[PDB]
Amino acid sequence: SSQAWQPGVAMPNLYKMQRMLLEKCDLQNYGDSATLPKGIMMNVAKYTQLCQYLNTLTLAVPYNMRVIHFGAGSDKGVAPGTAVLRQWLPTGTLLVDSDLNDFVSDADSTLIGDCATVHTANKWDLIISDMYDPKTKNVTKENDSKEGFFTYICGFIQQKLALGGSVAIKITEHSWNADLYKLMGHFAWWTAFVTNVNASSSEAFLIGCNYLGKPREQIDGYVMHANYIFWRNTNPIQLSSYSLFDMSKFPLKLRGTAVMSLKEGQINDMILSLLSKGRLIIRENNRVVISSDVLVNNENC
Amino acid sequence: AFAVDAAKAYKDYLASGGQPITNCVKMLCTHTGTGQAITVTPEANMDQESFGGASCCLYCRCHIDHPNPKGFCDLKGKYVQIPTTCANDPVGFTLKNTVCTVCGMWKGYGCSCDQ
Ligand SMILES: CSC[C@H]1O[C@@H](n2cnc3c(N)ncnc32)[C@H](O)[C@@H]1O
Ligand SMILES: [Zn+2]
Ligand SMILES: [Zn+2]
C-alpha cells in the first residue's frame, strides 16, 4: 500500500494480541532485492530507515545524550551503521560502538571483543544492537529461544538503560530471545519494525520506547515471537527504497529532555507518566566510562 | 630514522593503475549542504557525495599511526565531502588535496578565496 512510501512497517497491534504457535517463516518475496540508490550500502539504507522510523516515536533526547551501539562492525572493516547513527543523532551525542571483530569507526570510542566483556560505569539513553550470528539461519534445527548475546543484552538493559531510554535490537526468524520480548513489556510502548529496503528478510528491530524499569504488561516471549512470525508469514511487504530519497527531515531533534537523578522510592505515578511520554530521563549525569574485559593467556610451552 | 610512508605508497599504487580503496561509507543526504570539505554532519552540495570520515582516511583504513604528532585524525567522527567526479577514490582525494583554512572548502574544489 501506502506502506511503500514509509521507511518500513511496524507490527500491527492486533498481531501482538494473538496467541499463535511458532511456525517456520516463509516470506513470499524471499530473494527479492531492493534497488538501492547508486553507491549506497545496504546497511546505510537499513539504518537510515530505522532512524527515520525512530523519528516518529517519543524518544527522550537530552543534552549530553549517550548512545551505545553493539554489533557495529562489518565484513568490510567499517561501520556503516555507526556513521548513520552519528549523522542522525544531535551533534555532540556521545556514541560508543562495539563488535567482536576489528573495524574502523566514527564513534567516539570503539571496543573490540565479545559483547559480554563490555562494562560501563554510566547509564545510556539509547541502545542499538545489530549483533547477529548467521549460523542461526539453520532451517534443519528446531527454532528455540537463543541465549548468547541476547542474555547479555537483557541484563545490560535492566542494569544500564536509563529510565525513559529506548532500544532497537535486531532479530530474525532464528535470532531471537523470549526474555527480550518479555522485557519489551517494561517500556511504555514497543514494536517490531521491518525496514522497507530489507522487507524480504525475516529481520526486524525490536523497539522498546521509554523504559520504565518494571513490568507494564506481562508478555510471554515465546508466544510473542510466534505472533511476529505469523505477521511476517501473512503480510508480504513490498520492497521499497522510496524513503531514502527524502532526507530533509532526517536529523533527530535535540529536545533537551530533562535528566534527573532519582532513587527508587521517589518514582511516583507522575514521574512514570513523564517517562512514558518521552519527557524525562532518570540517570546520573556523570562521566561516560567504558571498558572491555580481556582474557590473559600465556601460550608458551 | 625510519617510518613507513603510506601516503607515497598509495599514490605510487594509484599511478601504477591500482584499484582505489573501496567500501568508503557514503551517506544519504539532501545534497543541499554548504559544500565545505570536512563537517560535523553531511554537507554535500549538488556536485558532491558525503562520506563517513573514518572510512575515507588512509591511516584509519590501513591500521597505521596518524602523521599527526598527537596521533589525532582529521576525518574520523566527521563527514568528508568529495566531488562526485572523484567519488570513485575518496581516500586518494582526501590524501592528495587540502582544505582552505579560511573558508573550509577544498582548495581547487570550492575555495574561491583567490578572487
Ligand atoms: C552487522 S552484521 C552482525 C555483527 O554482529 C557481530 N556480533 C555477533 N555476535 C556478537 C557478539 N557476541 N559480540 C559482539 N559482536 C557480535 C558480528 O561480529 C557482526 O559484525
Ligand atoms: Zn584517520
Ligand atoms: Zn578559501
Residue numbers in the entry:
A (entry chain A): 6799 to 7099
B (entry chain B): 4271 to 4385
Give the published text.
Non-structural protein 10 (nsp10) and non-structural protein 16 (nsp16) are part of the RNA synthesis complex, which is crucial for the replication of severe acute respiratory syndrome coronavirus 2 (SARS-CoV-2). Nsp16 exhibits 2’-*O*-methyltransferase activity during viral messenger RNA capping and is active in a heterodimeric complex with enzymatically inactive nsp10. It belongs to the class I methyltransferases and contains a Rossmann-fold, typical for methyltransferases, to bind SAM as the methyl donor and ^m7^GpppN-RNA (Cap0-RNA) as the methyl acceptor.
To understand whether the binding of SAM can be imitated by two individual smaller fragments, we sequentially soaked MTA and glycine, resulting in ligand electron density for both compounds. The potential interactions of the bound glycine with the protein are the same as the glycine corresponding part of the methionyl moiety of SAM.
